[PDB]
Design a protein around this ligand. Sequence first.
Ligand code: ZN
Length: 36
Amino acid sequence: GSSGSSGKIFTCEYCNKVFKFKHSLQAHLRIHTNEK
Ligand SMILES: [Zn+2]
């Protein structure tokens, strides 16, 4: 079909940051979470 028919991007509702893959974001949320 197309090289990028659907270019879904993961956005962070914490710092309004976008990523390439899901994990990329999930891992980032680490710095967002508190009470480590
Ligand atoms: Zn964030």
